[PDB]
PDB file of C-alpha atoms and ligand atoms in Angstrom:
ATOM      1  CA  UNK Q   1      27.166  44.090-100.061  1.00 15.90           C
ATOM      2  CA  UNK Q   2      27.183  40.475-101.087  1.00 17.29           C
ATOM      3  CA  UNK Q   3      25.707  39.716-104.583  1.00 16.89           C
ATOM      4  CA  UNK Q   4      25.381  35.722-104.329  1.00 17.95           C
ATOM      5  CA  UNK Q   5      24.804  33.097-101.754  1.00 20.29           C
ATOM      6  CA  UNK Q   6      26.140  29.497-102.508  1.00 19.30           C
ATOM      7  CA  UNK Q   7      24.416  26.694-100.871  1.00 18.01           C
ATOM      8  CA  UNK Q   8      25.592  23.437 -99.800  1.00 18.22           C
ATOM      9  CA  UNK Q   9      22.599  20.975 -99.970  1.00 18.13           C
ATOM     10  CA  UNK Q  10      22.834  18.061 -97.644  1.00 19.95           C
ATOM     11  CA  UNK Q  11      22.618  19.262 -94.057  1.00 14.95           C
ATOM     12  CA  UNK Q  12      21.697  22.952 -95.190  1.00 12.76           C
ATOM     13  CA  UNK Q  13      18.683  22.697 -97.260  1.00 13.15           C
ATOM     14  CA  UNK Q  14      17.368  19.578 -95.911  1.00 11.38           C
ATOM     15  CA  UNK Q  15      18.246  16.711 -93.385  1.00  8.93           C
ATOM     16  CA  UNK Q  16      19.786  14.585 -96.046  1.00  8.40           C
ATOM     17  CA  UNK Q  17      23.177  14.454 -94.321  1.00  8.63           C
ATOM     18  CA  UNK Q  18      21.541  11.839 -91.860  1.00  7.49           C
ATOM     19  CA  UNK Q  19      20.510   9.740 -94.877  1.00  6.19           C
ATOM     20  CA  UNK Q  20      23.987   9.685 -96.170  1.00  6.03           C
ATOM     21  CA  UNK Q  21      25.532   8.814 -93.001  1.00  6.10           C
ATOM     22  CA  UNK Q  22      22.908   5.920 -92.474  1.00  5.94           C
ATOM     23  CA  UNK Q  23      23.604   4.677 -96.015  1.00  7.49           C
ATOM     24  CA  UNK Q  24      27.406   4.731 -95.556  1.00  3.28           C
ATOM     25  CA  UNK Q  25      27.294   3.163 -92.107  1.00  5.47           C
ATOM     26  CA  UNK Q  26      25.084   0.246 -93.611  1.00  5.88           C
ATOM     27  CA  UNK Q  27      27.726  -0.106 -96.601  1.00  6.91           C
ATOM     28  CA  UNK Q  28      30.648  -0.088 -94.192  1.00  8.70           C
ATOM     29  CA  UNK Q  29      29.061  -2.792 -91.808  1.00  7.85           C
ATOM     30  CA  UNK Q  30      28.161  -4.892 -94.883  1.00  4.95           C
ATOM     31  CA  UNK Q  31      31.932  -5.202 -95.713  1.00  2.53           C
ATOM     32  CA  UNK Q  32      32.880  -5.568 -91.858  1.00  2.00           C
ATOM     33  CA  UNK Q  33      34.003  -1.906 -91.098  1.00  2.00           C
ATOM     34  CA  UNK Q  34      32.213  -0.907 -87.840  1.00  2.00           C
ATOM     35  CA  UNK Q  35      34.093   2.496 -87.411  1.00  2.00           C
ATOM     36  CA  UNK Q  36      31.504   4.745 -89.236  1.00  2.00           C
ATOM     37  CA  UNK Q  37      30.007   6.481 -86.264  1.00  2.00           C
ATOM     38  CA  UNK Q  38      28.645  10.020 -86.057  1.00  2.00           C
ATOM     39  CA  UNK Q  39      32.145  11.426 -85.061  1.00  2.00           C
ATOM     40  CA  UNK Q  40      33.825   9.572 -88.087  1.00  2.00           C
ATOM     41  CA  UNK Q  41      31.104  10.821 -90.294  1.00  2.00           C
ATOM     42  CA  UNK Q  42      32.112  14.538 -89.687  1.00  2.00           C
ATOM     43  CA  UNK Q  43      35.024  13.402 -92.087  1.00  2.00           C
ATOM     44  CA  UNK Q  44      32.541  12.179 -94.762  1.00  2.00           C
ATOM     45  CA  UNK Q  45      30.101  15.273 -94.740  1.00  2.00           C
ATOM     46  CA  UNK Q  46      31.020  17.236 -97.909  1.00  2.00           C
ATOM     47  CA  UNK Q  47      33.042  14.533 -99.573  1.00  2.00           C
ATOM     48  CA  UNK Q  48      32.391  12.898-103.013  1.00  2.00           C
ATOM     49  CA  UNK Q  49      30.746   9.563-103.283  1.00  2.00           C
ATOM     50  CA  UNK Q  50      34.205   7.824-104.254  1.00  2.00           C
ATOM     51  CA  UNK Q  51      36.197   9.729-101.776  1.00  2.00           C
ATOM     52  CA  UNK Q  52      33.744   8.783 -98.952  1.00  3.43           C
ATOM     53  CA  UNK Q  53      34.089   5.030 -99.742  1.00  3.19           C
ATOM     54  CA  UNK Q  54      37.919   5.320 -99.978  1.00  2.00           C
ATOM     55  CA  UNK Q  55      37.926   7.166 -96.547  1.00  2.00           C
ATOM     56  CA  UNK Q  56      35.870   4.270 -95.101  1.00  2.00           C
ATOM     57  CA  UNK Q  57      38.093   1.572 -96.684  1.00  2.00           C
ATOM     58  CA  UNK Q  58      41.237   3.502 -95.211  1.00  2.00           C
ATOM     59  CA  UNK Q  59      39.824   3.709 -91.746  1.00  2.00           C
ATOM     60  CA  UNK Q  60      39.898  -0.132 -91.914  1.00  2.00           C
ATOM     61  CA  UNK Q  61      43.264  -0.438 -93.866  1.00  2.00           C
ATOM     62  CA  UNK Q  62      41.026  -2.601 -96.206  1.00  2.00           C
ATOM     63  CA  UNK Q  63      41.813  -3.023-100.041  1.00  2.00           C
ATOM     64  CA  UNK Q  64      39.265  -4.198-102.417  1.00  2.00           C
ATOM     65  CA  UNK Q  65      39.300  -4.706-106.160  1.00  2.00           C
ATOM     66  CA  UNK Q  66      38.476  -2.063-108.858  1.00  2.58           C
ATOM     67  CA  UNK Q  67      35.321  -3.919-109.565  1.00  4.48           C
ATOM     68  CA  UNK Q  68      34.217  -4.272-105.911  1.00  2.34           C
ATOM     69  CA  UNK Q  69      35.000  -0.442-105.406  1.00  2.00           C
ATOM     70  CA  UNK Q  70      32.690   0.340-108.162  1.00  2.45           C
ATOM     71  CA  UNK Q  71      29.950  -2.069-106.955  1.00  2.44           C
ATOM     72  CA  UNK Q  72      29.968  -0.801-103.501  1.00  2.19           C
ATOM     73  CA  UNK Q  73      29.802   2.931-104.381  1.00  2.00           C
ATOM     74  CA  UNK Q  74      26.736   1.907-106.577  1.00  3.58           C
ATOM     75  CA  UNK Q  75      25.174  -0.247-103.877  1.00  4.58           C
ATOM     76  CA  UNK Q  76      25.366   2.797-101.454  1.00  2.00           C
ATOM     77  CA  UNK Q  77      23.863   5.208-103.957  1.00  2.00           C
ATOM     78  CA  UNK Q  78      21.070   2.744-104.930  1.00  2.35           C
ATOM     79  CA  UNK Q  79      20.131   2.464-101.090  1.00  2.00           C
ATOM     80  CA  UNK Q  80      20.349   6.268-100.716  1.00  2.00           C
ATOM     81  CA  UNK Q  81      18.103   6.952-103.737  1.00  2.68           C
ATOM     82  CA  UNK Q  82      15.610   4.725-102.456  1.00  2.65           C
ATOM     83  CA  UNK Q  83      15.765   6.351 -99.040  1.00  3.59           C
ATOM     84  CA  UNK Q  84      15.046   9.922-100.494  1.00  2.00           C
ATOM     85  CA  UNK Q  85      12.048   9.148-102.799  1.00  2.00           C
ATOM     86  CA  UNK Q  86       9.602  10.525-100.245  1.00  2.00           C
ATOM     87  CA  UNK Q  87      11.581  13.684 -99.590  1.00  2.00           C
ATOM     88  CA  UNK Q  88       9.028  16.684-100.137  1.00  2.00           C
ATOM     89  CA  UNK Q  89       8.474  20.324 -99.470  1.00  2.00           C
ATOM     90  CA  UNK Q  90       7.730  19.639 -95.827  1.00  2.00           C
ATOM     91  CA  UNK Q  91      11.351  18.429 -95.460  1.00  2.00           C
ATOM     92  CA  UNK Q  92      12.920  21.772 -96.228  1.00  2.00           C
ATOM     93  CA  UNK Q  93      14.795  22.979 -93.278  1.00  2.00           C
ATOM     94  CA  UNK Q  94      13.341  25.892 -91.165  1.00  2.67           C
ATOM     95  CA  UNK Q  95      14.405  29.340 -92.826  1.00  3.24           C
ATOM     96  CA  UNK Q  96      15.527  28.271 -96.051  1.00  8.21           C
ATOM     97  CA  UNK Q  97      12.425  28.739 -98.309  1.00 10.32           C
ATOM     98  CA  UNK Q  98      11.834  32.191 -96.824  1.00 11.16           C
ATOM     99  CA  UNK Q  99      15.716  32.833 -97.306  1.00  7.35           C
ATOM    100  CA  UNK Q 100      15.461  31.955-101.043  1.00  8.50           C
ATOM    101  CA  UNK Q 101      12.367  34.265-101.400  1.00  7.64           C
ATOM    102  CA  UNK Q 102      14.079  37.044 -99.585  1.00  9.26           C
ATOM    103  CA  UNK Q 103      17.380  36.739-101.786  1.00  9.27           C
ATOM    104  CA  UNK Q 104      15.492  36.817-105.009  1.00  8.62           C
ATOM    105  CA  UNK Q 105      13.427  39.971-103.841  1.00  9.42           C
ATOM    106  CA  UNK Q 106      16.671  41.552-103.040  1.00  6.04           C
ATOM    107  CA  UNK Q 107      18.183  40.526-106.536  1.00  3.88           C
ATOM    108  CA  UNK Q 108      20.776  38.405-104.750  1.00  2.00           C
ATOM    109  CA  UNK Q 109      21.939  35.323-107.074  1.00  2.00           C
ATOM    110  CA  UNK Q 110      21.408  31.729-105.626  1.00  2.00           C
ATOM    111  CA  UNK Q 111      23.440  28.923-106.667  1.00  5.26           C
ATOM    112  CA  UNK Q 112      23.874  25.203-105.699  1.00  3.15           C
ATOM    113  CA  UNK Q 113      27.418  24.192-104.734  1.00  2.00           C
ATOM    114  CA  UNK Q 114      26.710  20.645-103.772  1.00  4.96           C
ATOM    115  CA  UNK Q 115      28.906  17.584-104.438  1.00  3.47           C
ATOM    116  CA  UNK Q 116      25.816  15.354-104.754  1.00  2.53           C
ATOM    117  CA  UNK Q 117      24.788  14.045-108.160  1.00  2.00           C
ATOM    118  CA  UNK Q 118      21.543  13.594-106.496  1.00  2.00           C
ATOM    119  CA  UNK Q 119      21.272  17.387-105.987  1.00  2.00           C
ATOM    120  CA  UNK Q 120      18.921  18.255-108.927  1.00  2.00           C
ATOM    121  CA  UNK Q 121      16.447  15.265-108.076  1.00  4.62           C
ATOM    122  CA  UNK Q 122      16.289  16.602-104.389  1.00  3.15           C
ATOM    123  CA  UNK Q 123      15.585  20.208-105.254  1.00  5.71           C
ATOM    124  CA  UNK Q 124      12.745  18.974-107.473  1.00  3.23           C
ATOM    125  CA  UNK Q 125      11.422  16.755-104.698  1.00  4.83           C
ATOM    126  CA  UNK Q 126      11.341  19.839-102.431  1.00  7.34           C
ATOM    127  CA  UNK Q 127       9.874  22.314-105.129  1.00  3.68           C
ATOM    128  CA  UNK Q 128      13.016  24.495-104.840  1.00  6.88           C
ATOM    129  CA  UNK Q 129      14.554  24.237-108.442  1.00  5.68           C
ATOM    130  CA  UNK Q 130      12.799  27.612-109.458  1.00  5.17           C
ATOM    131  CA  UNK Q 131      14.732  29.573-106.720  1.00  4.01           C
ATOM    132  CA  UNK Q 132      18.065  28.442-107.961  1.00  5.00           C
ATOM    133  CA  UNK Q 133      19.831  30.910-110.684  1.00  6.72           C
ATOM    134  CA  UNK Q 134      22.322  27.951-111.190  1.00  6.52           C
ATOM    135  CA  UNK Q 135      23.292  24.369-110.289  1.00  9.04           C
ATOM    136  CA  UNK Q 136      26.910  23.732-110.438  1.00  7.34           C
ATOM    137  CA  UNK Q 137      27.285  20.261-111.948  1.00 10.60           C
ATOM    138  CA  UNK Q 138      29.863  18.236-109.590  1.00 13.39           C
ATOM    139  CA  UNK Q 139      30.728  15.963-112.415  1.00 11.95           C
ATOM    140  CA  UNK Q 140      32.018  18.883-114.371  1.00 12.08           C
ATOM    141  CA  UNK Q 141      34.689  20.266-111.635  1.00  9.19           C
ATOM    142  CA  UNK Q 142      38.331  18.870-112.203  1.00 10.45           C
ATOM    143  CA  UNK Q 143      38.414  18.653-108.252  1.00 13.10           C
ATOM    144  CA  UNK Q 144      35.685  17.938-105.598  1.00 12.13           C
ATOM    145  CA  UNK Q 145      35.431  19.508-102.137  1.00 12.67           C
ATOM    146  CA  UNK Q 146      37.477  20.295-100.181  1.00 12.15           C
ATOM    147  CA  UNK Q 147      38.949  21.867-103.499  1.00 12.98           C
ATOM    148  CA  UNK Q 148      37.148  25.143-104.105  1.00  9.14           C
ATOM    149  CA  UNK Q 149      36.133  24.355-107.791  1.00  8.49           C
ATOM    150  CA  UNK Q 150      32.318  23.701-107.213  1.00  6.35           C
ATOM    151  CA  UNK Q 151      31.841  27.181-105.147  1.00  8.33           C
ATOM    152  CA  UNK Q 152      34.039  28.880-107.961  1.00  6.50           C
ATOM    153  CA  UNK Q 153      31.850  27.093-110.849  1.00  7.18           C
ATOM    154  CA  UNK Q 154      28.625  28.141-108.738  1.00  6.85           C
ATOM    155  CA  UNK Q 155      29.770  31.788-108.594  1.00  6.05           C
ATOM    156  CA  UNK Q 156      30.754  31.840-112.338  1.00  6.44           C
ATOM    157  CA  UNK Q 157      27.574  30.137-113.171  1.00  6.25           C
ATOM    158  CA  UNK Q 158      25.648  33.284-111.726  1.00 10.29           C
ATOM    159  CA  UNK Q 159      28.340  35.834-112.840  1.00  8.35           C
ATOM    160  CA  UNK Q 160      29.578  36.968-109.305  1.00 10.57           C
ATOM    161  CA  UNK Q 161      33.046  36.768-107.950  1.00  8.80           C
ATOM    162  CA  UNK Q 162      33.500  34.278-104.942  1.00  7.62           C
ATOM    163  CA  UNK Q 163      34.893  37.269-102.788  1.00  9.44           C
ATOM    164  CA  UNK Q 164      31.266  38.888-103.346  1.00 11.70           C
ATOM    165  CA  UNK Q 165      29.546  35.501-102.161  1.00 13.58           C
ATOM    166  CA  UNK Q 166      28.595  33.913 -99.004  1.00 14.17           C
ATOM    167  CA  UNK Q 167      28.754  30.145 -98.702  1.00 16.06           C
ATOM    168  CA  UNK Q 168      26.460  27.940 -96.488  1.00 19.44           C
ATOM    169  CA  UNK Q 169      27.919  24.738 -95.025  1.00 17.86           C
ATOM    170  CA  UNK Q 170      27.453  22.055 -92.486  1.00 18.65           C
ATOM    171  CA  UNK Q 171      30.766  20.360 -93.006  1.00 20.61           C
ATOM    172  CA  UNK Q 172      34.577  20.405 -92.735  1.00 23.04           C
ATOM    173  CA  UNK Q 173      35.420  19.659 -96.494  1.00 23.81           C
ATOM    174  CA  UNK Q 174      32.929  22.265 -97.700  1.00 25.44           C
ATOM    175  CA  UNK Q 175      34.054  25.020 -95.143  1.00 23.75           C
ATOM    176  CA  UNK Q 176      37.408  24.527 -96.574  1.00 25.45           C
ATOM    177  CA  UNK Q 177      36.188  24.719-100.097  1.00 24.91           C
ATOM    178  CA  UNK Q 178      34.538  28.098 -99.588  1.00 25.52           C
ATOM    179  CA  UNK Q 179      37.489  29.375 -97.903  1.00 22.88           C
ATOM    180  CA  UNK Q 180      39.799  28.518-100.879  1.00 22.87           C
ATOM    181  CA  UNK Q 181      37.085  30.094-103.270  1.00 22.86           C
ATOM    182  CA  UNK Q 182      37.141  33.350-101.743  1.00 19.27           C
ATOM    183  CA  UNK Q 183      33.614  33.446-100.437  1.00 20.65           C
ATOM    184  CA  UNK Q 184      32.637  34.237 -96.676  1.00 15.31           C
ATOM    185  CA  UNK Q 185      31.416  30.931 -94.860  1.00 13.39           C
ATOM    186  CA  UNK Q 186      28.652  30.797 -92.387  1.00 14.29           C
ATOM    187  CA  UNK Q 187      28.373  27.076 -91.058  1.00 16.76           C
ATOM    188  CA  UNK Q 188      25.441  25.386 -89.341  1.00 20.38           C
ATOM    189  CA  UNK Q 189      26.066  22.750 -86.695  1.00 21.35           C
ATOM    190  CA  UNK Q 190      28.496  22.274 -83.773  1.00 21.96           C
ATOM    191  CA  UNK Q 191      31.733  24.394 -83.138  1.00 19.37           C
ATOM    192  CA  UNK Q 192      33.132  21.001 -81.923  1.00 20.29           C
ATOM    193  CA  UNK Q 193      32.688  19.728 -85.670  1.00 20.27           C
ATOM    194  CA  UNK Q 194      33.187  22.828 -87.708  1.00 19.60           C
ATOM    195  CA  UNK Q 195      35.588  24.956 -85.805  1.00 20.50           C
ATOM    196  CA  UNK Q 196      35.618  28.249 -83.698  1.00 15.30           C
ATOM    197  CA  UNK Q 197      37.101  30.578 -86.281  1.00 11.61           C
ATOM    198  CA  UNK Q 198      33.976  31.389 -88.606  1.00  7.76           C
ATOM    199  CA  UNK Q 199      30.602  32.301 -87.903  1.00  7.30           C
ATOM    200  CA  UNK Q 200      28.478  29.209 -86.997  1.00  6.57           C
ATOM    201  CA  UNK Q 201      24.720  29.033 -86.170  1.00  5.92           C
ATOM    202  CA  UNK Q 202      23.158  26.266 -84.363  1.00  5.72           C
ATOM    203  CA  UNK Q 203      20.340  25.606 -86.753  1.00  4.67           C
ATOM    204  CA  UNK Q 204      19.166  26.783 -90.240  1.00  4.66           C
ATOM    205  CA  UNK Q 205      16.290  29.247 -88.678  1.00  4.59           C
ATOM    206  CA  UNK Q 206      19.382  31.569 -88.104  1.00  4.67           C
ATOM    207  CA  UNK Q 207      19.928  31.623 -91.894  1.00  2.85           C
ATOM    208  CA  UNK Q 208      17.786  34.941 -92.501  1.00  2.00           C
ATOM    209  CA  UNK Q 209      18.689  37.634 -94.946  1.00  3.92           C
ATOM    210  CA  UNK Q 210      18.919  39.924 -91.921  1.00  6.73           C
ATOM    211  CA  UNK Q 211      21.640  37.856 -90.309  1.00  8.33           C
ATOM    212  CA  UNK Q 212      23.526  37.379 -93.519  1.00  3.43           C
ATOM    213  CA  UNK Q 213      23.752  41.270 -93.774  1.00  4.91           C
ATOM    214  CA  UNK Q 214      24.545  41.394 -90.072  1.00  4.86           C
ATOM    215  CA  UNK Q 215      27.438  38.993 -90.686  1.00  6.15           C
ATOM    216  CA  UNK Q 216      28.641  40.646 -93.978  1.00  8.12           C
ATOM    217  CA  UNK Q 217      28.787  44.069 -92.201  1.00  8.95           C
ATOM    218  CA  UNK Q 218      30.942  42.678 -89.443  1.00  7.42           C
ATOM    219  CA  UNK Q 219      33.455  40.741 -91.853  1.00  7.29           C
TER     220      UNK Q 219
HETATM  221  O1  BG6 I   1      26.471  10.392-103.626  1.00  8.56           O
HETATM  222  P1  BG6 I   1      26.051  11.898-103.977  1.00  8.56           P
HETATM  223  O2  BG6 I   1      24.727  12.024-103.762  1.00  8.56           O
HETATM  224  O3  BG6 I   1      26.750  12.205-105.149  1.00  8.56           O
HETATM  225  O4  BG6 I   1      26.686  12.823-102.830  1.00  8.56           O
HETATM  226  C1  BG6 I   1      28.044  13.153-102.624  1.00  8.56           C
HETATM  227  C2  BG6 I   1      28.369  13.871-101.473  1.00  8.56           C
HETATM  228  O5  BG6 I   1      27.437  15.080-101.437  1.00  8.56           O
HETATM  229  C3  BG6 I   1      27.685  16.144-100.299  1.00  8.56           C
HETATM  230  O6  BG6 I   1      26.918  17.021-100.403  1.00  8.56           O
HETATM  231  C4  BG6 I   1      27.336  15.155 -99.026  1.00  8.56           C
HETATM  232  O7  BG6 I   1      27.835  15.986 -97.931  1.00  8.56           O
HETATM  233  C5  BG6 I   1      28.251  13.825 -99.004  1.00  8.56           C
HETATM  234  O8  BG6 I   1      27.908  13.122 -97.897  1.00  8.56           O
HETATM  235  C6  BG6 I   1      28.086  13.005-100.297  1.00  8.56           C
HETATM  236  O9  BG6 I   1      28.907  11.957-100.208  1.00  8.56           O
HETATM  237  F1  ALF I   2      26.341  18.565 -98.086  1.00 10.26           F
HETATM  238 AL1  ALF I   2      26.996  18.738 -99.863  1.00 10.26          AL
HETATM  239  F2  ALF I   2      27.652  19.288-101.419  1.00 10.26           F
HETATM  240  F3  ALF I   2      25.281  19.030-100.514  1.00 10.26           F
HETATM  241  F4  ALF I   2      28.697  18.687 -99.255  1.00 10.26           F
HETATM  242 MG1   MG I   3      26.398  19.243 -96.566  1.00 10.38          MG
HETATM  243 NA1   NA I   4       8.479  18.661-107.123  1.00  6.54          NA
END
């Protein structure tokens, strides 16, 4: 049986992938880059703040100064942080709170494997901090998603091997990070975005402990 579940945050625990998208698109258009649409944004999900900005600049073959790069990432983050101040427990995605309760009942460790430095603030907004056995600090890994380091760190943090873990993700970068960590991925979203080669569910109501067991047994 699996011994840990490693959670992405944005687009898995709550609908904050939408707010990252809207904030990055606003940032891009301010600097004359109009190509950040929903299709392009599939390449930004799971990617660090600085890597996201660089992918947007690269889309436009645009070069900025080191000073302007730092200011742009800070500008987007300040906008995003204002957007999330009113997040509340009512914004937890369907199934997620019950899953956390069921995992703890069954002595399955719970770790956050988020790239977001805003992760702890968001778990507090949603009254979820108490469910987590560990939060892997994304500033501490030497390599961000799609590198597996954050999932390895989340597992290490709860004393479980990646190979004994399930990872939950809504992104391309994060699915690759889980694969390379040794854990079993279960994606949430569209197969057209996340692929046809792992288990994908259409929405988070499907993330029940019953279903994670159903998937783990059929691995
Ligand atoms: O800018 P933050 O809050 O540190 O978030 C980093 C990344 O966190 C990931 O969880 C999101 O999918 C990305 O969209 C985001 O860029
Ligand atoms: F959406 Al994340 F780490 F929370 F990639
Ligand atoms: Mg995500
Ligand atoms: Na709170």
